[model samples]
Target chain A: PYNKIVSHLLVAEPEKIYAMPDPTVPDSDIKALTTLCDLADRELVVIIGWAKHIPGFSTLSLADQMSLLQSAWMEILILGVVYRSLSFEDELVYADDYIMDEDQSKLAGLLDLNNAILQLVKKYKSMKLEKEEFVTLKAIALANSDSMHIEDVEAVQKLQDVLHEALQDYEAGQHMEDPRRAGKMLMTLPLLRQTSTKAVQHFYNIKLEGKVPMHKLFLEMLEAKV
Target chain B: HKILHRLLQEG
Candidate 1:
């Protein structure tokens, strides 16, 4: 029943997940979908380990950490994808090899995936996000206490206060007069609520269909039902 | 990309 322990499986997990069957030429529908699934599983593994990196992340009880990580995990992941793809003319940077367009998403009837992803990229991209802002936003996204899944609301609220304070300080220093700088960045949370909800549905349904197998770690978070 | 890569290395 206990699954979310920190571990040295870093070495082993990537071995199980990488080398995604030549993503450059995703001619087959299953091939494309499977590649995306593999990428997601890998992203999930990467994300689980990142909770410790966020300030005040490990301060919460173990279950609280799990709740935040599992709950906002996809929102944080999409933030990274959008940052990577901001400079691109068409493709949202999935990886060096796998660049996706709406056509690619339509292949699996996930037509909204590409556009919604692009919509996010457009928003963050418009702000001309810097690495500092990106990392802060990632941290901000993680400590979201609004989810009913959170077990220790007070602890999570404390952590949320810390992260939001850190963000305002950082953004305020950048633009003292434009106070909404931080407001707008944190504002994307509701938008991601939709993106991650439909997103998990489509991706996990891809798994329920039993086409591509995800890593146990990925399955843990996705299957947590928290 | 750098953030994910940095996290991968640190992990």
Candidate 2:
């Protein structure tokens, strides 16, 4: 069931933004920026789709579902990006053709946040996460416990509990001798949330520079108005 | 409200 659900969501790959002839051109840079935002937008849509299609997710109240998306989308999006870029050691690949190395990202004032993302990519790569583990971790991230705006906090927490147990079972089965596997995976969530917050700030800073127009859906989600 | 959620979720 988990495999089926994950496969459905992973069917579509986000479109890529190719490098421009003049890397220093402002317009070219803005185009690349919007392309990255579009990739994130596509991934968010996939995560939301998976959440709704999960057997018990539709049972939640309308308010609760929106609250979950508003609170959890950023983290899930960052996780997706990290997962997608796992194979790239030094470059963060937003799309097939759009890749950013540390120096390029730093020039755009994304040094700190990009470094955080690099750390996460390294951590997850070292952990050697399986598909089921990745999908369930995503589920747990979506069913966040820290969302204060949710009216039914207990219900949301209940969902998170189920995912956590599922993750534990998965880790136990995958790594019989390593009791610390589950603990290590769970520890990454806090850092994931922090990275997502910084990524949001990076987006807004880009917006303030007036180089590219932030996608409406991305802005709404960031504002918690989605 | 639920419809909006569905639209956003289904997108």
Candidate 3:
């Protein structure tokens, strides 16, 4: 059921992958940056929608829901990119035109951060995460209560625990006798969070340089102090 | 407007 909901939310794909910006073209750099930001904006919306429609999510207090969304948006966006770019080796695809190699990202001052994203992608791809496992991981990631502003940290933690249990049950059903599989999956959460922090930094750096004007919603999500 | 529209629709 949760799998179906996730599938529904992620149904739309970006219109086209724009080519890398050509400094020679008029405003090409800004255009390309806009495309990338728009892609992130759209994906973030879908992820939040998916989270909202989850069976138990609506039951949470409004404050808790907003807290979780603010906390997890960047991580979830990075995860979506990792999944989308799985077919490309060493290059991350934000959109058709926005596919970026490490060198290109470095030019944009995201070299180190892009490396972390690429590494995380490679690790998770090697793990061959199944659909059920991926959705459950997303749930656990979204329900994280590490942020100090959550009014009911214990409640959110309980939700994450439930999602973790769900992932374990899923692994047990699909890969019997593999006691370590679920542990390995859970370990990726910290990695995802670490990489996402860098990704957020990269976004801010670019925005500060006027490379892209972020969507208001994306800015709000990033600026949420809690 | 699109963002606001979607927010309202989704909510």
Candidate 4:
């Protein structure tokens, strides 16, 4: 007992703290956030904070503006799930500085983002997105974010691999388990590491001269043209 | 008779 070393760890207690809108946040931004939430149902109202500030977003009527915001919200949430395993904190920190607590509305935004991620994860299991779209979207995510960080690159690849494997199994009538049940199985798979390895290998094989633009690469794979 | 036949056909 004397020779053994004991390690101690401290975990922070969970807080029900609410983030308030930042004083620096312009009135326009606050209005935009509120407007988007109103357009979507309660299930979708949470992710308004992740909507990117667009140039002409304000010029559109309230409905059109909300539509644009919704589209952005969906893409960003999908991207978040694909890149960081549906961990909102990780995605925010990865994107830019001060993203952890950007403003008051961010809390609701993250909750919405989480809901969308959960929905997609379920959809992916339920044979949604089709096999081809899954691959193309994955290719897009990989091509775009591969150079950002190793972890980020790996996360996207993981989703791609899981979807691919799930599709292969489903088409064979092998892993025809219900979506809810399969989600439990998917959560434990070594998806991140396996996909990351495959992505890196794919990148090495391409070896094209000059830097490849992510948008072009994604467009080429997804739409068959850049 | 027509309605029944039409419904059966649609089904």
Candidate 5:
């Protein structure tokens, strides 16, 4: 299979380590959510590189690219986490063995944040989402950066439209399909957005409580609008 | 037309 999309996607992807954590000390086990957040910080660099190479992304005014990314990075990461962890049954794998089931997530003070992610991942897996659709969705999610104060709203909107059409055509091109899949896939984004927003609320509260184990760059991301 | 085709070549 010589698909251009998958090859381009793999080039920017990170090496995934699927190891299990030891349940040695109370303190170590209690650090689950924060530990996953730390791993997320490590993944931030690779995701940005992928975004840059997205066809129309680099053509935006430099500031616009940063602006859209600031608003959309978390959702992108959440989607990535969902797809990567799909093979591990019901856990949300956050890089480098940082996997969590509902019980572990709840104990880590995630409330239903992780629950929401697992639920979405279940639907995605049930749908048997294609790699091309998944990758294109990430682009479509961010390309329409309609947040307040975007410098070039028209350009961003246009890019999003192009991505959306491409996705529809790609999905329609699927063998033995009704082409309704593009619609269903687009519908998944609202939950992704809401779940990412809920995640920020928890992250912000933890940051305020001090002893934040997350990176400074993540701290800056929250400051942007969490 | 350009980006979707996906062979990465500098212009």
Candidate 6:
């Protein structure tokens, strides 16, 4: 028999025997527990696919059941993170293409699904962090400490001076011309935006008498986007 | 909120 590549299917090969009890689970409950876990994972895949008619779960030929389950499982696994993170409505709309099996090789389809999921998840996380929680955290910090500390004020000023002196180092390490660094920055842009925006916003709020005008900040951020 | 609409018309 030829070797088959397992892209996303969770098929139990009848020919090869797996140990009856998975070592991961306690021996006392291994048999039933393992079965339950495997079934739950399969059900998760089916639910993600929004399968109106699940083959393996109901009346169907053994071969058809295996094939349909395998196909749907592969599609859902490829877009696992996206399916896991998105709201049901968002998954049905923005993530529809991800869970649908397109006419492509297994590897290619998997890659496309993975990429879309990664992008969307990152975007969602970034937006969530940028909300009122960040604003409140920054407000507290800036109010409590006026960007300075008791004895550390001089140390902080010196540190900023050193940073300014090391401008060349900073530029060489992270400039537009350096494609490698640029890519790295782009990879972490969402996280950086989430963090730095909170810090700066808090600083600005403290400077402007404990309140950040939402409209002005929104316009500023919009301009920054451009 | 200010009359920025006039700026567009001026151009």
Candidate with the greatest TM-score versus the true structure: 5
Instruction: Give the better candidate number (5 or 6) by TM-score.
Output: 5
Clashes of 6: 0
Candidate 1 collision pairs: none
Q: What's the fnat for candidate 6, on a 0 to 1 scale?
A: 0.00
In terms of docking quality, model 4 is incorrect
Query: Model 2 clash pairs?
Result: none
What tens digits encode model 2's per-residue C-alpha lDDT throughout A1-226? 3334344434423333332324565644555577667666566655566577554566788778777777777787777667778888877865555677887776656678878988899999999866566767777788863777778767777787766777777677668888899889989998898898788877877767777666666666765643
> Which lDDT tens digits does candidate 4 get at residues A1-226?
1100000000111112222334575644334343222222221233322111222222334433333332232243333334333234323321221233335335434443434334455544444433233323332232233232223334445444644443344433533455443344344233433443343333333324223222232222222111
lDDT of 3 by residue, A1-226 (tens): 3334344333422233333455565644466566667777676666666676555666777767776777777887777667768778999876665678876776655668778889987988898866566666777788773666788767777777766667776677677767799999988889999888777777777767775788887766665674
Clashes of each: 0, 0, 6, 1, 0, 0
- What candidate 6 gets wrong by more than 4 Å, as runs, is A1-57, A87-113, A119-226, B1-11
RMSD in angstroms between candidate 4 and the native structure over all alpha carbons = 22.9
Model 5 ranges with Cα > 4 A deviation = A1-7, A17-30, B1-11
Candidate 6 C-alpha lDDT tens digits along A1-226: 1112110112321121122334575433223323322433433333323322221222332322233323223223222333344443223122222222222213222333334444545654543432122222211122122221123344334433432323323334435365343233234434333443443343344335523222332223222211
- What is residue B8's positional error in candidate 2, in angstroms? 4.5
Question: Please, what are the lDDT tens digits per residue for candidate 1 over residues A1-226?
Answer: 1111111112222222243567376477887776777787677766667567666666666656766776787887777778788899657777667777777768767777768878888887788876666766776677773566677788787877776776676676666767898888878777776787778777778778887666666566567665
What residue pairs clash in candidate 5, if any at all?
Answer: none
lDDT of 5 by residue, A170-205 (tens): 776673356578888988888888888788777788
* Interface RMSD, one decimal, each candidate: 9.3, 3.8, 4.8, 23.0, 12.2, 23.0
Return the lDDT, model 3, position A224: 65
lDDT of 6 by residue, B1-11 (tens): 12112211222
Q: Name the weakest run of 10 consecutive residues (lDDT summed) in model 6 chain A.
A: A1-10
**What are the runs in model 2 whose C-alpha is more than 4 Å off?**
A1-28, B1-11
Model 5 C-alpha lDDT versus the unseen true structure: 0.70
TM-score of each: 0.81, 0.82, 0.80, 0.21, 0.83, 0.19
TM-score of chain B of each: 0.64, 0.65, 0.72, 0.73, 0.32, 0.46
Q: Which TM-score does chain B of candidate 6 obtain? A: 0.46
